[PDB]
Design a protein around this ligand. Structure first.
Ligand SMILES: Nc1nc2c(ncn2[C@@H]2O[C@H](COP(=O)(O)OP(=O)(O)NP(=O)(O)O)[C@@H](O)[C@H]2O)c(=O)[nH]1
Ligand SMILES: Nc1nc2c(ncn2[C@@H]2O[C@H](COP(=O)(O)OP(=O)(O)O)[C@@H](O)[C@H]2O)c(=O)[nH]1
Ligand SMILES: [Mg+2]
Ligand code: NI
Length: 170
């Protein structure tokens, strides 16, 4: 068993808590309420005979909680920087989160850039962050890159496995 300290960061309402609920409980709530400060969750994944245990701090993305974020990313081994593919503002905030982690988090943190809510693009939804622009930011800044839907589950497990496949196991 190998534990991995992970933090989620990103603008309010991009779906951080929904990504974690999908990963931990395989559930989705259209009425998920804003997180208060942060929430802790765990989930285990199997890689061959290894158990990889994620210790997850799901931070609140509202500015009223912004000064709590450093305590949760301070000793994180992995971060998910989440934006909403239908909200270009949230991608500007993702860019700022990547620079803050490069300045202030551990020098050996692994970062995944995650564009969420892609299910919305198959209904009444506008893609306002091209996948290629997410990929470009990830390539330039040395991040993993995924697009996800917490609502359908699409690629959510792939995000967490992609991180666990890059950290040495016990
Ligand atoms: N269609 C769709 N809705 C989603 C998706 N992920 C989250 N949502 C919805 O978006 C809203 C905000 O989700 P939530 O997980 O609370 O986001 P958050 O980033 O944790 N907000 P906070 O930072 O304030 O805690 C909710 O209504 C939720 O159901 C997704 O992939 N698709
Ligand atoms: N990322 C990662 N993959 C691992 C690790 N240990 C095993 N694996 C995966 O498990 C596959 C098979 O593992 P191996 O130890 O060769 O076990 P075997 O195939 O059962 O005899 C490896 O090829 C990897 O894909 C590990 O520490 N990290
Ligand atoms: Mg939340
Ligand atoms: Ni092994």
């Amino acid at each position: 068993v190998t534990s991995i300290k992970l933090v989620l960061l990103g603008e309010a309402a991009v779906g951080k808590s929904s990504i974690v609920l999908r990963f931990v409980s395989n559930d989705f709530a259209e009425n998920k309420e804003p997180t208060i400060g942060a929430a802790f969750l765990t989930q285990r994944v199997t890689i061959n005979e290894h158990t990889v245990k994620f210790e997850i701090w799901d931070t609140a993305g509202q500015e009223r909680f912004a000064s709590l974020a450093p305590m949760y990313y301070r000793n994180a081994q992995a971060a998910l920087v989440v934006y909403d593919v239908t909200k270009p503002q949230s991608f500007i905030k993702a860019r700022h989160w990547v620079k803050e982690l490069h300045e202030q988090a551990s020098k050996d943190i692994i970062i995944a850039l995650v564009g969420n809510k892609i299910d919305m693009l198959q209904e009444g939804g506008e893609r306002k962050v091209a996948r290629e622009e997410g990929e470009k930011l990830a390539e330039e800044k040395g991040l993993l890159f995924f697009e996800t839907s917490a609502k359908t589950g699409e690629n959510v497990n792939d995000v967490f496995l992609g991180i666990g496949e890059k950290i040495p196991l016990k």
